[PDB]
Amino acid sequence: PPSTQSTEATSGVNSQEVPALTAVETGASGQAIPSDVVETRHVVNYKTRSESCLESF
Amino acid sequence: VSQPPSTQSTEATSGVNSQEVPALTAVETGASGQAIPSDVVETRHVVNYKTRSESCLESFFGRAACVTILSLTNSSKSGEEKKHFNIWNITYTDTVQLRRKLEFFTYSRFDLEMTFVFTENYPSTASGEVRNQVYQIMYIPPGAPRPSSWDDYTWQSSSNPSIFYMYGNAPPRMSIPYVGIANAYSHFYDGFARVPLEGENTDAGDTFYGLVSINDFGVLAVRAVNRSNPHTIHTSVRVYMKPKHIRCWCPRPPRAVLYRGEGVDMISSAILPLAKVDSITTF
Amino acid sequence: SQPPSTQSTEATSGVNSQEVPALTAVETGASGQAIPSDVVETRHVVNYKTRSESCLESFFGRAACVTILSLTNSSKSGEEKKHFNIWNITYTDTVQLRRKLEFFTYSRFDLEMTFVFTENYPSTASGEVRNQVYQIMYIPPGAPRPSSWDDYTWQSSSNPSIFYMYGNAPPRMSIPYVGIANAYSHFYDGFARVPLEGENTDAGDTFYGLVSINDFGVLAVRAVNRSNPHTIHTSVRVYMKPKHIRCWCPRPPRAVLYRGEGVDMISSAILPLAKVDSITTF
Amino acid sequence: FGRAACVTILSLTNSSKSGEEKKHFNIWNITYTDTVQLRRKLEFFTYSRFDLEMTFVFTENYPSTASGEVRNQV
Amino acid sequence: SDRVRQITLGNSTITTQEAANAIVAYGEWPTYINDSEANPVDAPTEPDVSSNRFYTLESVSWKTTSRGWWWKLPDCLKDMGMFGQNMYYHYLGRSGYTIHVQCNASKFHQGALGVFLIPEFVMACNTESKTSYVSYINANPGERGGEFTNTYNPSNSEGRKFAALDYLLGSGVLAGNAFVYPHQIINLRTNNSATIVVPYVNSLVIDCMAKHNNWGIVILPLAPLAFASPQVPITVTIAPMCTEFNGLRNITVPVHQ
Amino acid sequence: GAQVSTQKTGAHENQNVAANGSTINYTTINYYKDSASNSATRQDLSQDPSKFTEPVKDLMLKTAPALN
Amino acid sequence: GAQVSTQKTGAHENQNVAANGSTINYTTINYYKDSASNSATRQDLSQDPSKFTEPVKDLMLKTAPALN
Amino acid sequence: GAQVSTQKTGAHENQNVAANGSTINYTTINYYKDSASNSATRQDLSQDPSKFTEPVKDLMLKTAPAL
Amino acid sequence: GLPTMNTPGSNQFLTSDDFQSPCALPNFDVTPPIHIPGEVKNMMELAEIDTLIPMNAVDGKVNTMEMYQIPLNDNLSKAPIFCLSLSPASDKRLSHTMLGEILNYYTHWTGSIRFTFLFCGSMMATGKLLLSYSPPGAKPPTNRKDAMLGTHIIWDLGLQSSCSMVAPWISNTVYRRCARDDFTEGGFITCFYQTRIVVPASTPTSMFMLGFVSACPDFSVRLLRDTPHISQSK
Amino acid sequence: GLPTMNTPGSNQFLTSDDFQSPCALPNFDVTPPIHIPGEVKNMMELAEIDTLIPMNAVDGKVNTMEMYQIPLNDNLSKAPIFCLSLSPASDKRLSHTMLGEILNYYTHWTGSIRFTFLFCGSMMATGKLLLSYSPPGAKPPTNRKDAMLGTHIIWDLGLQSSCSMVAPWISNTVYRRCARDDFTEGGFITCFYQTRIVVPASTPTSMFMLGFVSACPDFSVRLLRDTPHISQS
Amino acid sequence: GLPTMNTPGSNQFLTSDDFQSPCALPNFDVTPPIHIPGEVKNMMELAE
Ligand SMILES: CCCCCCCCCCCCCC(=O)O
Numbered sequence A: 001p002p003s004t005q006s007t008e009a010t011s012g013v014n015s016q017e018v019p020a021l022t023a024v025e026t027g028a029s030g031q032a033i034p035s036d037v038v039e040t041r042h043v044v045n046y047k048t049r050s051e052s053c054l055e056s057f
Numbered sequence B: 001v002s003q004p005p006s007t008q009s010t011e012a013t014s015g016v017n018s019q020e021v022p023a024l025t026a027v028e029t030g031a032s033g034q035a036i037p038s039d040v041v042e043t044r045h046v047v048n049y050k051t052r053s054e055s056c057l058e059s060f061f062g063r064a065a066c067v068t069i070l071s072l073t074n075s076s077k078s079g080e081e082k083k084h085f086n087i088w089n090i091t092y093t094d095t096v097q098l099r100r101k102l103e104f105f106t107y108s109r110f111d112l113e114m115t116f117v118f119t120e121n122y123p124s125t126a127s128g129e130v131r132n133q134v135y136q137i138m139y140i141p142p143g144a145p146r147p148s149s150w151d152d153y154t155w156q157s158s159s160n161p162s163i164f165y166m167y168g169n170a171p172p173r174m175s176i177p178y179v180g181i182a183n184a185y186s187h188f189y190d191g192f193a194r195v196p197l198e199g200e201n202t203d204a205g206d207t208f209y210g211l212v213s214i215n216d217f218g219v220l221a222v223r224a225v226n227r228s229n230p231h232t233i234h235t236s237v238r239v240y241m242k243p244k245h246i247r248c249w250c251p252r253p254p255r256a257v258l259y260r261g262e263g264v265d266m267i268s269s270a271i272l273p274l275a276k277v278d279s280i281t282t283f
Numbered sequence C: 001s002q003p004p005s006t007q008s009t010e011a012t013s014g015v016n017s018q019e020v021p022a023l024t025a026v027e028t029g030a031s032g033q034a035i036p037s038d039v040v041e042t043r044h045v046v047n048y049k050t051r052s053e054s055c056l057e058s059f060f061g062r063a064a065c066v067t068i069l070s071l072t073n074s075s076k077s078g079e080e081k082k083h084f085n086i087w088n089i090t091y092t093d094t095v096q097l098r099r100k101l102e103f104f105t106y107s108r109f110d111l112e113m114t115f116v117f118t119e120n121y122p123s124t125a126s127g128e129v130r131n132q133v134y135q136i137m138y139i140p141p142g143a144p145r146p147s148s149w150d151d152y153t154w155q156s157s158s159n160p161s162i163f164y165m166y167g168n169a170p171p172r173m174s175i176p177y178v179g180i181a182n183a184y185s186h187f188y189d190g191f192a193r194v195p196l197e198g199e200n201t202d203a204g205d206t207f208y209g210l211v212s213i214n215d216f217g218v219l220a221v222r223a224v225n226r227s228n229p230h231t232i233h234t235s236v237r238v239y240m241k242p243k244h245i246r247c248w249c250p251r252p253p254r255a256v257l258y259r260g261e262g263v264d265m266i267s268s269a270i271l272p273l274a275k276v277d278s279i280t281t282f
Numbered sequence D: 001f002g003r004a005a006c007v008t009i010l011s012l013t014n015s016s017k018s019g020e021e022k023k024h025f026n027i028w029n030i031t032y033t034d035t036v037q038l039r040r041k042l043e044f045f046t047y048s049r050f051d052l053e054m055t056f057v058f059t060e061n062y063p064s065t066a067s068g069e070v071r072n073q074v
Numbered sequence E: 001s002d003r004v005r006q007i008t009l010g011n012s013t014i015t016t017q018e019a020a021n022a023i024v025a026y027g028e029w030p031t032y033i034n035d036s037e038a039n040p041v042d043a044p045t046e047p048d049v050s051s052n053r054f055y056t057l058e059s060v061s062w063k064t065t066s067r068g069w070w071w072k073l074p075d076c077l078k079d080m081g082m083f084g085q086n087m088y089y090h091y092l093g094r095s096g097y098t099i100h101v102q103c104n105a106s107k108f109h110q111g112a113l114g115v116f117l118i119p120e121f122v123m124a125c126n127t128e129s130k131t132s133y134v135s136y137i138n139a140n141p142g143e144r145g146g147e148f149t150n151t152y153n154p155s156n157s158e159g160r161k162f163a164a165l166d167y168l169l170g171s172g173v174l175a176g177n178a179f180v181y182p183h184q185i186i187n188l189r190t191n192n193s194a195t196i197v198v199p200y201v202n203s204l205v206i207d208c209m210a211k212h213n214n215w216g217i218v219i220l221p222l223a224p225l226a227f228a229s230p231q232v233p234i235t236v237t238i239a240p241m242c243t244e245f246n247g248l249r250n251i252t253v254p255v256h257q
Numbered sequence F, G: 001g002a003q004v005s006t007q008k009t010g011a012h013e014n015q016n017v018a019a020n021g022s023t024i025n026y027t028t029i030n031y032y033k034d035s036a037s038n039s040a041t042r043q044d045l046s047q048d049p050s051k052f053t054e055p056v057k058d059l060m061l062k063t064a065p066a067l068n
Numbered sequence H: 001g002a003q004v005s006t007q008k009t010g011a012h013e014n015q016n017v018a019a020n021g022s023t024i025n026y027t028t029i030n031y032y033k034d035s036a037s038n039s040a041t042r043q044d045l046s047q048d049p050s051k052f053t054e055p056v057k058d059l060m061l062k063t064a065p066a067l
Numbered sequence I: 001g002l003p004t005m006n007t008p009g010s011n012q013f014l015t016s017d018d019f020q021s022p023c024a025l026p027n028f029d030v031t032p033p034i035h036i037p038g039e040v041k042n043m044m045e046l047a048e049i050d051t052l053i054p055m056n057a058v059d060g061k062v063n064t065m066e067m068y069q070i071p072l073n074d075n076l077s078k079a080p081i082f083c084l085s086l087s088p089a090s091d092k093r094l095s096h097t098m099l100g101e102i103l104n105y106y107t108h109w110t111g112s113i114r115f116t117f118l119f120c121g122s123m124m125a126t127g128k129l130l131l132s133y134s135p136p137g138a139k140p141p142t143n144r145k146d147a148m149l150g151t152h153i154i155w156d157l158g159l160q161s162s163c164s165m166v167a168p169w170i171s172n173t174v175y176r177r178c179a180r181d182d183f184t185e186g187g188f189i190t191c192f193y194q195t196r197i198v199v200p201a202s203t204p205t206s207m208f209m210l211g212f213v214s215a216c217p218d219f220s221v222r223l224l225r226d227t228p229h230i231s232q233s234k
Numbered sequence J: 001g002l003p004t005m006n007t008p009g010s011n012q013f014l015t016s017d018d019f020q021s022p023c024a025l026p027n028f029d030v031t032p033p034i035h036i037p038g039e040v041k042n043m044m045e046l047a048e049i050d051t052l053i054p055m056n057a058v059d060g061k062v063n064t065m066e067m068y069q070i071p072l073n074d075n076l077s078k079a080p081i082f083c084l085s086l087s088p089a090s091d092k093r094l095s096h097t098m099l100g101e102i103l104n105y106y107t108h109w110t111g112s113i114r115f116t117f118l119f120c121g122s123m124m125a126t127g128k129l130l131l132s133y134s135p136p137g138a139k140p141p142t143n144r145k146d147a148m149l150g151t152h153i154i155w156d157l158g159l160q161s162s163c164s165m166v167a168p169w170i171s172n173t174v175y176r177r178c179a180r181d182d183f184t185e186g187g188f189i190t191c192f193y194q195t196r197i198v199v200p201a202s203t204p205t206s207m208f209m210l211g212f213v214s215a216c217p218d219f220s221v222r223l224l225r226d227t228p229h230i231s232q233s
Numbered sequence K: 001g002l003p004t005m006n007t008p009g010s011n012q013f014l015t016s017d018d019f020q021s022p023c024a025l026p027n028f029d030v031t032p033p034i035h036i037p038g039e040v041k042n043m044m045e046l047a048e
């Protein structure tokens, strides 16, 4: 089966291009994830979105 | 199609005058001595085809047990509406035989089967005729709305699972997958739901120490579906539950005293598990 | 292949030889072996008949009534104890079955059990009573037994049990061979304990025989429904048959009606045969 | 000969009276001769060989004026 | 020989002349959380030297009238210097432990102490009404620990405290079956110490230290401290293993007494 | 995983050979894990009467005098 | 999509090694979407009591002096 | 005509890889002429949230200036 | 799910059922078998064992040990000295033998029957006996002449202390009823002296014979039934 | 419309059955497993764990910690130190040990039983004890001679203080009842001094020893049953 | 008739019951699907 998204390990960022900044006026939702905001660890994620399928709902 | 393994077999063994003798050890190490009769006495060869099938955890916990008895009344009097349905906390605490078996382990993981044995009788001499009734067992997960009466909107059960059973038919049955949050259910919780902080009541924790404050799996809501009759009929559900696909961790001692309540707490009148013997030398 | 048949007859003519299959001696412990082809002139006969109904599996393959238990569901407080009935596990209650089982000294088999229920209003006045469910549970020796119909032991966490609604198909269950021996014995020429020097001057009178030796626990049957203004007498019949059966060391059939669970006789019935006027009377 | 036919009627009574206990059971000689349609069909032949299957139909009533509760019988 | 052992962790060492070998609960050595099994998503704090070192708890006196002593494991170490600070600064954490218990005596002393480690050491409430459980404060004795009694006096300070008969381990089980738990025994005749290696054990990979006591420590006299009253000190020294934390926050300060 | 066996013959069936017709064929599947739950075994027509009728240590022949 | 497994031995089996041929088998088919609906698992008798009876860091042999 | 599909993982099933054992499969047969009679179909775990969360004519990267 | 139809016979209990059923004791360890001696596989193995015939049915010899002892004398006589009606299950003298009792669990039976006799007189006495089977539908064997017309052997008393007479399966029916069916008449088994027993001086002049009955190898039984020889109170 | 017939046993609830049952929560995602320490596969893995025998359940010692302490003295004694009947699920002292408690859930059992004893005396004291097992059906040992006749081992005081004895599986039946039975008893266990304990000056003149019981590797049980030890109002 | 046995769970109605059933309208001709912009597969797509 398809699964949910995992988390990659990250470190400090000194980039001139920052994922935490955006503009919701465009109509798009913000796209940042924890790995962009803070340093993260690798996590394997098997918490599958099955109960949330329309067929199950 | 392989033959299952047997318990330990015995090799024929002669007596010995060994200077390396397994009889002595040091239990202080935390390790049990491992002597088998061939290490102590002369033995014959014994072919052992006996197994430990009945002691597998799957077999040990493989029987359904009554876990709770619920009761409800179908009647037509002004003070009886509230008795038409029964709301119950899901737990195995209510019955001691199952609880004790589960308490052999600190943690466990399993799927469950729920089986419901219904019965009814007349609590009143009117002894009048009533029609065969349909009963509804609805599950209300924690945080879900609960019914105020037996006749309410929550009984619509649009998202909640619910089972409808007729009296006289086979006991209804359903499977429940492991629904724990943790990776196993904890049978015990040496902790608090929350941590009282510096800015709190000295006695804080008195209302939440233990498993009693973190274990919440919702309730079952049981009602007669049928509208009431002129003749009162008393009914009840003997709820049976069975572990299936069960594995356990971290074994611990079985309870020696009369349970009581939700925790491990004992009562003063029942703190004496053993009988007296007149002498240390009595057979 | 083809199920083996009983002995066929070969044809034979008259014999004036010195072989004599007609004469023998039974003093040796052997049975006579003569057949018609040894005794008379014969024709050939093809025998395809099969001894199938005489196989032990067939002989013991039908369920027999073993016991009848009486339960009453009643609102009278003085009758509350009758709400349940505890029966010893045994096959000694009914004579037709014992008679066949006791043909063998030893046996091994799996057991099929079924129950038949029926009910009535034993009282003068009948009235509405709801369908009852019965709880049948096995309580192995050493397991706690209920003191009452509503005794907590009916939780049955380990003790196996059946919940049956009156009117549905008669309940059924399979029980594997449960001996602690490699066979069930139908007899026991011995004592549970050996009385020793001193103690009881002449003990064993209270513990001789199979009746002492093999304790199989009890079967407890309760009504599961609470009481009603009108009460019900409920009869449960227990039926049994050996299945997957083997037997050893055959014995004579019993001639005397059984004086209960032992091998004991009643002085009133030790004369199994009817008389005939004489040896020469057909 | 492919259809089942009624071959006999038995009468059973559950009796609350001191008498008629004997009517609780009924012993019948097995035969098909109680019924004319079936025996006539069989009697087309001098000899026959067949396996036989039996089906029973139970029906009951409450014959007395004093009607009242009776549990389902077996 | 196996009697002499040296345990080195972090920046401190225990050297023992008479140890009864060593025990690892379930034979499972403590390890760090694998990527394949993780709830937290933030990079973890791994204060290996500051946390994985031995600390000594205040010793207790063994008298012929003692009926036992007990500790909640992470609780006894909750105020323990730098280790304690990380426990209060982080929401989540995990650690194994090395628990070393020592009790010296003369060859002329007689008696024994059993050391048992209990996962989820849930103790019974002292008060009979059972309408009140044990308060946070009373349930968490700190470094000093608590004691076992031989009588049950459930008076309706008692209302909110734990009580335990030594006999039933505060659990309603017989103490003689305590051996089901990882254990080692200090027999004064045979050894001065017991060493047990403890993995983190829970239904969760990682949990909150301020709310849950992963293990408890139970020490009971098994045999009286006979001598030809005598008194003998018992010292308990513990080090965290593979300590890690997640969920950094402002300092947590628990309800105080 | 069904097993099959020859059915016992009936009124319109073949001779006692029971070898004539593939139509004489009872098919069965066991549905339980304990073999104690299985239906009864196949008829076992194996017999050995000598155990009870001729358990003589000596070799006895029917034509030979029983005695000598 | 059935599985065929052997049965636990009953009274009639003279092979307590489960070696009497196809005679002893049962057939199982899972009929549901979730495995939680499946019947109880296959028996697994693998055990390792040393976990609880001899969880010693140092390997001990039964005839070894427990302590040297 | 029977189909065989993998069952949803239970309490004591294999690893999350969902590819271990034959005991994790189930068999199903449709017994009706009308497909509306079929039991619920299998879940489709495919998702595409960008349809509603990033329906932008001109695609942007997360670190790109939004304006 | 799967459309099904319940047929007649559904939800009924037949004592002759042979159906599978769930085990009340799952995964139970059945104590392993051992080679228990004396295995019986078929009831016919017992039917073939020679057991005694309680022939001396005369009042006063009934239900006693003497019941199996058939008197013989050296007195000259032409009288019958033995009269059986054969029906193994219904003959008062045979129904209580093991063969008869096995047959009292069956409705029908076939095959030849063997009758074995043992002389237990003095070693010194000699003589000859006529053992005979006469098919049914005939005047009972009133005398030796009729016995000679039927199937018979002569037993010449000597070292071979026993003999066997066989009553072959001569029947119009394939099987006979075990029940006392006048239609399937057994026939008659009798015995006459072929010659007076010769007894030398100073020996007993009155001696006994024992008789045995057993199934022949072509013997079989059919449907199982309740035996009328056992009863109990309600 | 496949023709079918409902056999006896239909529409009944057996608490020990094993049938499939539809999930009430279809497609529910089950929390993934982790390697939780201390996994148990079988109850017998626990049956083999040594636990203490509450042997001294005598007046003044009943239901207390001292119940597990077996007294020893340095005086001459010909008396047994202790006696047990080997009935692990029915004896007042044994039915409460871990072995007894697991076994209280079973009807029948087999295999050998191991006992281990430990001297909790001074290092200064020396001497020797006789541990002995006598099979069933005979006067239980009344003295040391009887103890020497049956199976026995001599346990010296020494550095390897612990000593085990195994009561071998000697039985007529294959399995014994867990339940007390006039027919089936497991024989007797006793202990006598082999020699007086020798105690040096300023050394305790009285000691204790602890006793433990556990299943041997050939141990097994036959059938699960309700236990008598727990009850409920 | 093929021997069968009804197990517990027979003749019950569970609101989450997932099985086959007869068609109320045999051979009914179902209106063809058309593409409609905005297809949703999962509730989580809206949660985001
Ligand atoms: C429509 C009725 C659905 C029945 C829901 C029962 C839920 C049972 C699982 C929750 C309890 C888990 C903890 C435990 O094993 O006791």
Ligand SMILES: CCCCCCCCCCCCCC(=O)O
Pocket: C089, C090, C091, C111, C137, C138, C160, C161, C173, C175, C178, C184, C185, C216, I024
């Ligand atoms: C839930 C029902 C379990 C009942 C188990 C009781 C034992 C049944 C066997 C009784 C007959 C034993 C003696 C024999 O077969 O000769």
